[PDB]
RNA sequence: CCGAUAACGAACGAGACUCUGGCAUGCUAACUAGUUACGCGACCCCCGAGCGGUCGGCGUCCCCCAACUUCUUAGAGGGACAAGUGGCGUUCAGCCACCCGAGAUUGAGCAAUAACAGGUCUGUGAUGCCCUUAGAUGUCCGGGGCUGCACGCGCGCUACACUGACUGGCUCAGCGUGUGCCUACCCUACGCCGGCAGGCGCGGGUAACCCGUUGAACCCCAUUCGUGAUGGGGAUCGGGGAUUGCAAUUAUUCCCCAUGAACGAGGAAUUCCCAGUAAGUGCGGGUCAUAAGCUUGCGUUGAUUAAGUCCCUGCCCUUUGUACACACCGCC
């Protein structure tokens, strides 16, 4: 049953949410954008480097395989 | 900070850069249409192996006093699905490791040793590991 | 009715009954109460010294 | 010792069931009251705990 | 770290085994808080030496299972020294508490053993040596994090770090704490 | 006259001969410090002796290891075992014994076969099976 | 990021825009992944993009090249059609064209009463593997 | 085994043994090991650190009339022997735990009496008898078949993918194996050529020297991909090109293109096994002109779990019943 087909590129309204909505998570990865939002996952892969424009989100530690990717860095 | 003292995988990253930012080596024509080794499935993405592989090959010679084409083929290996068959080991492409050696020879990173096999020459011995200083001292990270 | 949780470990491992050789019969101190003595069949590998857990503190699991 | 706590009375011996069991040989053997001995042994009629 | 033997980055001190019974079987630190979860290992030689192996590494091994991945401890040692770095972000404190106060309340208190019972097999309530609980709990969350992570791209480090929180808390939201329920539930039906 | 204590520790067929000279002492395997080697997930693994006993404890001890044989992972408890054994023979033979014993304690309170050779080695295959023990599946009607 | 293309149609064969450009070329009969980068390497189309992007010039640049390969340096590995036989032409067949060529060489073998033809005619293996146990449909 | 003991003391099997596998800074040594580290005497280039002294380091310049066995090798040795202590035990035979440490078990070969129309006459110039015996079932040439295909079962491999797929890179062996062999024939280092198969140059090799620090895969690390029967998978065919072979049609084997399948974890069943074990993973050997999805070894990565019971299957003894002794697959 598990069928999950998502658009390759974020729509502008959607992008704002990623610009907007991505600040509202902690445990982020190409997964957590492609399941919460309906982004492919390679464009999520991509979006997550775009979102290092000025570290809107924080890298704990990019492991070769898995980005491993935290909340903004508030306090 | 020799080739060893530098964390060897971000060596060839910068040594690939060297030979690109030199703007000379002798890139040729079998290039865009190359398999790399019958070994592989598919032609490589970074369109610029041999700047990064001549990097490898040349540092490799630094680590080892003598190496033939037969040697270079050997070292860049892998498993090889003959498919439903089990995987076996296939040598890399000669042509490419050879022209990598001959091209390194153009800049005179390397030379043909005595007793057969290529080794790297003092001049090249430099360009190689000069940047080792620059890779360690790029920054501590 | 009565529903507590009591942890006790039998002082001595006694036998290894059960059909397939599963259950190691144990004589277990209540732990919650020193005085109480119960016999139960345990499934995991036990020994002399180790605490174990039974849902009902009455059944006193007999020959099986 | 459950019952000797809960006893209204003090001490108390408790009774006993005196059943005269009384098996046919079939069930005596099937349900392991006696067994089945050697030729020399069949004779030895003592009752040994 | 010569002062005290930590764990890549991690405190193993200020960690307590929060239910006696499992204590002395969960070897988070005798004094012996190992740094890594790779270890030579030979805790499969004698029988109750198996416990003295640290619950952490004991979980890496329990994770490198399934046909295409046996004996890739290098691999899974990442996953687990990679998973814990997620928990501490969510919970805080030693995520080793989240591991240890998972296994405790990931695994049951008693279980349902199969006796022969003539023909119709009425399983019997028996307690367990902290082993069939510990072990079952251990796969059930491995298997759980595993099963959840075929066809989402969920990181096994993430997927496991769900389960270890969802079982550290009696959260009833994992795979381990969802079967820890039933074995007890099946046992209750038996008696 | 400085120290010159050579000591080996093994795992499977990975002989790793360490050796301890007196100097500044910053430690290295073949020809590269402990910070690399780069199975990497391990790493702390081979740092352990350092991190246990103290960064001070090799502060008059240049150690140089060499490794052949065995394999990727093995080569590491081989080099771990070696720089704990070698360092042990250091403080024993010329230096003292109390610190040798404070070391040997600090190590053997959690071994990980630090001074103890893992006695194990692989079983042979027997005919009628893929491995030692397992057997080619029984046909049966 | 421009979602405008919403898939594309190329060379008389339906193709998918979303899929990556190297992959998209793959679908047409006579191609494959091998040759389908090499086309996008001579053409100088940036390979890091989706077939539901690009312009009409790009996609024709593909067809001109892929349909007429040898002239834009593509050597003779990546000609599926090597010394055809009906004239010594050696080029790259595509589309139904290969089904046509395929059929014609089956027809040719068959017509020349030769074994390999008979074997297709009957519906068997051509390549002498044993069909005792496999080839059951 | 001890002991109860009409038996006492003996013999074969088990055990002991051999090979093997692991502790042996203990010995004898070793340019056909290694070497080791020196001494470092150097070349030596900033290979790298460092202003320079000095140092970290591969390579070499070696050689040697260093020195040595730290690992390598293989000889002699030792040891490990329920040996100590604490339980348990008829307080014997032993069992269990712990100490020192390899804790009494690392793994095979060898394997009795006695069997069995087991298999083998096609391993035997071992062969009883029988056939056949020139038109020869004597030996071959050419071809063909042993490969054929609506179905059935048997051992294998590869998958089903993202703890993974393909894209960079780093980098760790072992047991072997090799020419120049009983009749014509290898192992291969290093040059060019070619994409590659390969091709064409040339070099060492009765080998611990040459292949060959056997420079591997998983593995490990570097980017793609995004859960699509998709980039997994990878069948079936189209077309080329090499190689072996006098000859591959009946795709020989290999490469290069090109097509591009079912399988998204397997219905009824059932084998395998406890420690360096299962699994994966290549690699040798055997098979070989050509050549392996075969086995037999070898490491390598290396788990989970039983550590008990006889619940199923099948084995040992004892007692017993038995109309069975072609032995219950019986007898009736």
mmCIF file with all atom_site columns, C-alpha atoms in Angstrom, chain E residues 102-185:
data_model
loop_
_atom_site.group_PDB
_atom_site.id
_atom_site.type_symbol
_atom_site.label_atom_id
_atom_site.label_alt_id
_atom_site.label_comp_id
_atom_site.label_asym_id
_atom_site.label_entity_id
_atom_site.label_seq_id
_atom_site.pdbx_PDB_ins_code
_atom_site.Cartn_x
_atom_site.Cartn_y
_atom_site.Cartn_z
_atom_site.occupancy
_atom_site.B_iso_or_equiv
_atom_site.pdbx_formal_charge
_atom_site.auth_seq_id
_atom_site.auth_comp_id
_atom_site.auth_asym_id
_atom_site.auth_atom_id
_atom_site.pdbx_PDB_model_num
ATOM 1  C CA . UNK E 1 102 ? 14.443 1.417   27.741 1.00 0.00 ? 102 UNK E CA 1
ATOM 2  C CA . UNK E 1 103 ? 15.704 -2.198  28.086 1.00 0.00 ? 103 UNK E CA 1
ATOM 3  C CA . UNK E 1 104 ? 14.278 -2.237  31.688 1.00 0.00 ? 104 UNK E CA 1
ATOM 4  C CA . UNK E 1 105 ? 10.745 -1.238  30.599 1.00 0.00 ? 105 UNK E CA 1
ATOM 5  C CA . UNK E 1 106 ? 11.179 -2.426  26.992 1.00 0.00 ? 106 UNK E CA 1
ATOM 6  C CA . UNK E 1 107 ? 11.512 -5.955  28.358 1.00 0.00 ? 107 UNK E CA 1
ATOM 7  C CA . UNK E 1 108 ? 8.595  -7.371  30.497 1.00 0.00 ? 108 UNK E CA 1
ATOM 8  C CA . UNK E 1 109 ? 8.425  -8.607  34.086 1.00 0.00 ? 109 UNK E CA 1
ATOM 9  C CA . UNK E 1 110 ? 7.230  -12.195 33.319 1.00 0.00 ? 110 UNK E CA 1
ATOM 10 C CA . UNK E 1 111 ? 6.503  -14.438 30.332 1.00 0.00 ? 111 UNK E CA 1
ATOM 11 C CA . UNK E 1 112 ? 4.605  -17.302 28.640 1.00 0.00 ? 112 UNK E CA 1
ATOM 12 C CA . UNK E 1 113 ? 6.617  -20.577 28.306 1.00 0.00 ? 113 UNK E CA 1
ATOM 13 C CA . UNK E 1 114 ? 5.424  -23.491 26.192 1.00 0.00 ? 114 UNK E CA 1
ATOM 14 C CA . UNK E 1 115 ? 4.948  -26.690 28.136 1.00 0.00 ? 115 UNK E CA 1
ATOM 15 C CA . UNK E 1 116 ? 3.906  -29.866 26.203 1.00 0.00 ? 116 UNK E CA 1
ATOM 16 C CA . UNK E 1 117 ? 0.521  -30.069 27.989 1.00 0.00 ? 117 UNK E CA 1
ATOM 17 C CA . UNK E 1 118 ? -0.576 -33.370 26.290 1.00 0.00 ? 118 UNK E CA 1
ATOM 18 C CA . UNK E 1 119 ? -1.839 -31.915 22.941 1.00 0.00 ? 119 UNK E CA 1
ATOM 19 C CA . UNK E 1 120 ? -3.590 -28.529 23.314 1.00 0.00 ? 120 UNK E CA 1
ATOM 20 C CA . UNK E 1 121 ? -0.565 -26.445 24.287 1.00 0.00 ? 121 UNK E CA 1
ATOM 21 C CA . UNK E 1 122 ? -1.521 -24.328 27.305 1.00 0.00 ? 122 UNK E CA 1
ATOM 22 C CA . UNK E 1 123 ? 1.497  -22.159 27.859 1.00 0.00 ? 123 UNK E CA 1
ATOM 23 C CA . UNK E 1 124 ? 2.385  -21.564 31.470 1.00 0.00 ? 124 UNK E CA 1
ATOM 24 C CA . UNK E 1 125 ? 3.101  -18.334 33.271 1.00 0.00 ? 125 UNK E CA 1
ATOM 25 C CA . UNK E 1 126 ? 6.705  -18.285 34.283 1.00 0.00 ? 126 UNK E CA 1
ATOM 26 C CA . UNK E 1 127 ? 8.928  -15.486 35.451 1.00 0.00 ? 127 UNK E CA 1
ATOM 27 C CA . UNK E 1 128 ? 12.201 -15.149 33.545 1.00 0.00 ? 128 UNK E CA 1
ATOM 28 C CA . UNK E 1 129 ? 15.818 -14.713 34.281 1.00 0.00 ? 129 UNK E CA 1
ATOM 29 C CA . UNK E 1 130 ? 16.501 -11.296 32.864 1.00 0.00 ? 130 UNK E CA 1
ATOM 30 C CA . UNK E 1 131 ? 17.482 -12.746 29.571 1.00 0.00 ? 131 UNK E CA 1
ATOM 31 C CA . UNK E 1 132 ? 14.451 -13.779 27.460 1.00 0.00 ? 132 UNK E CA 1
ATOM 32 C CA . UNK E 1 133 ? 12.989 -10.361 28.445 1.00 0.00 ? 133 UNK E CA 1
ATOM 33 C CA . UNK E 1 134 ? 16.329 -8.585  27.827 1.00 0.00 ? 134 UNK E CA 1
ATOM 34 C CA . UNK E 1 135 ? 17.043 -10.333 24.557 1.00 0.00 ? 135 UNK E CA 1
ATOM 35 C CA . UNK E 1 136 ? 13.502 -10.315 23.124 1.00 0.00 ? 136 UNK E CA 1
ATOM 36 C CA . UNK E 1 137 ? 13.294 -6.625  24.075 1.00 0.00 ? 137 UNK E CA 1
ATOM 37 C CA . UNK E 1 138 ? 16.622 -6.153  22.317 1.00 0.00 ? 138 UNK E CA 1
ATOM 38 C CA . UNK E 1 139 ? 15.505 -7.590  18.927 1.00 0.00 ? 139 UNK E CA 1
ATOM 39 C CA . UNK E 1 140 ? 11.987 -6.384  19.235 1.00 0.00 ? 140 UNK E CA 1
ATOM 40 C CA . UNK E 1 141 ? 13.346 -2.802  19.179 1.00 0.00 ? 141 UNK E CA 1
ATOM 41 C CA . UNK E 1 142 ? 16.107 -3.748  16.647 1.00 0.00 ? 142 UNK E CA 1
ATOM 42 C CA . UNK E 1 143 ? 13.518 -5.604  14.514 1.00 0.00 ? 143 UNK E CA 1
ATOM 43 C CA . UNK E 1 144 ? 11.126 -2.663  15.126 1.00 0.00 ? 144 UNK E CA 1
ATOM 44 C CA . UNK E 1 145 ? 13.572 0.057   14.064 1.00 0.00 ? 145 UNK E CA 1
ATOM 45 C CA . UNK E 1 146 ? 14.590 -2.328  11.283 1.00 0.00 ? 146 UNK E CA 1
ATOM 46 C CA . UNK E 1 147 ? 11.065 -3.024  10.049 1.00 0.00 ? 147 UNK E CA 1
ATOM 47 C CA . UNK E 1 148 ? 10.075 0.642   10.210 1.00 0.00 ? 148 UNK E CA 1
ATOM 48 C CA . UNK E 1 149 ? 13.182 1.389   8.110  1.00 0.00 ? 149 UNK E CA 1
ATOM 49 C CA . UNK E 1 150 ? 12.726 -0.610  4.915  1.00 0.00 ? 150 UNK E CA 1
ATOM 50 C CA . UNK E 1 151 ? 10.605 1.703   2.819  1.00 0.00 ? 151 UNK E CA 1
ATOM 51 C CA . UNK E 1 152 ? 10.827 4.964   4.530  1.00 0.00 ? 152 UNK E CA 1
ATOM 52 C CA . UNK E 1 153 ? 14.385 6.305   4.167  1.00 0.00 ? 153 UNK E CA 1
ATOM 53 C CA . UNK E 1 154 ? 14.443 6.668   7.983  1.00 0.00 ? 154 UNK E CA 1
ATOM 54 C CA . UNK E 1 155 ? 17.960 6.562   9.371  1.00 0.00 ? 155 UNK E CA 1
ATOM 55 C CA . UNK E 1 156 ? 18.466 3.463   11.414 1.00 0.00 ? 156 UNK E CA 1
ATOM 56 C CA . UNK E 1 157 ? 20.080 5.849   13.973 1.00 0.00 ? 157 UNK E CA 1
ATOM 57 C CA . UNK E 1 158 ? 16.811 7.863   13.893 1.00 0.00 ? 158 UNK E CA 1
ATOM 58 C CA . UNK E 1 159 ? 14.571 4.812   13.711 1.00 0.00 ? 159 UNK E CA 1
ATOM 59 C CA . UNK E 1 160 ? 16.318 3.164   16.646 1.00 0.00 ? 160 UNK E CA 1
ATOM 60 C CA . UNK E 1 161 ? 16.386 6.552   18.555 1.00 0.00 ? 161 UNK E CA 1
ATOM 61 C CA . UNK E 1 162 ? 12.591 6.621   18.219 1.00 0.00 ? 162 UNK E CA 1
ATOM 62 C CA . UNK E 1 163 ? 12.318 3.150   19.727 1.00 0.00 ? 163 UNK E CA 1
ATOM 63 C CA . UNK E 1 164 ? 14.792 3.725   22.551 1.00 0.00 ? 164 UNK E CA 1
ATOM 64 C CA . UNK E 1 165 ? 12.779 6.861   23.666 1.00 0.00 ? 165 UNK E CA 1
ATOM 65 C CA . UNK E 1 166 ? 9.430  5.208   22.926 1.00 0.00 ? 166 UNK E CA 1
ATOM 66 C CA . UNK E 1 167 ? 10.571 2.330   25.147 1.00 0.00 ? 167 UNK E CA 1
ATOM 67 C CA . UNK E 1 168 ? 12.608 4.377   27.729 1.00 0.00 ? 168 UNK E CA 1
ATOM 68 C CA . UNK E 1 169 ? 9.357  6.091   28.377 1.00 0.00 ? 169 UNK E CA 1
ATOM 69 C CA . UNK E 1 170 ? 6.535  3.548   28.817 1.00 0.00 ? 170 UNK E CA 1
ATOM 70 C CA . UNK E 1 171 ? 5.380  5.327   25.714 1.00 0.00 ? 171 UNK E CA 1
ATOM 71 C CA . UNK E 1 172 ? 3.382  2.497   24.056 1.00 0.00 ? 172 UNK E CA 1
ATOM 72 C CA . UNK E 1 173 ? 4.528  3.930   20.726 1.00 0.00 ? 173 UNK E CA 1
ATOM 73 C CA . UNK E 1 174 ? 7.399  1.585   19.608 1.00 0.00 ? 174 UNK E CA 1
ATOM 74 C CA . UNK E 1 175 ? 7.765  -2.080  18.605 1.00 0.00 ? 175 UNK E CA 1
ATOM 75 C CA . UNK E 1 176 ? 9.464  -3.363  21.837 1.00 0.00 ? 176 UNK E CA 1
ATOM 76 C CA . UNK E 1 177 ? 6.936  -1.929  24.311 1.00 0.00 ? 177 UNK E CA 1
ATOM 77 C CA . UNK E 1 178 ? 4.107  -3.149  21.959 1.00 0.00 ? 178 UNK E CA 1
ATOM 78 C CA . UNK E 1 179 ? 5.144  -6.814  22.361 1.00 0.00 ? 179 UNK E CA 1
ATOM 79 C CA . UNK E 1 180 ? 6.339  -6.484  26.025 1.00 0.00 ? 180 UNK E CA 1
ATOM 80 C CA . UNK E 1 181 ? 2.616  -5.806  26.417 1.00 0.00 ? 181 UNK E CA 1
ATOM 81 C CA . UNK E 1 182 ? 1.409  -9.008  24.661 1.00 0.00 ? 182 UNK E CA 1
ATOM 82 C CA . UNK E 1 183 ? 3.724  -11.635 26.095 1.00 0.00 ? 183 UNK E CA 1
ATOM 83 C CA . UNK E 1 184 ? 2.414  -10.397 29.416 1.00 0.00 ? 184 UNK E CA 1
ATOM 84 C CA . UNK E 1 185 ? -1.062 -10.286 27.870 1.00 0.00 ? 185 UNK E CA 1
#
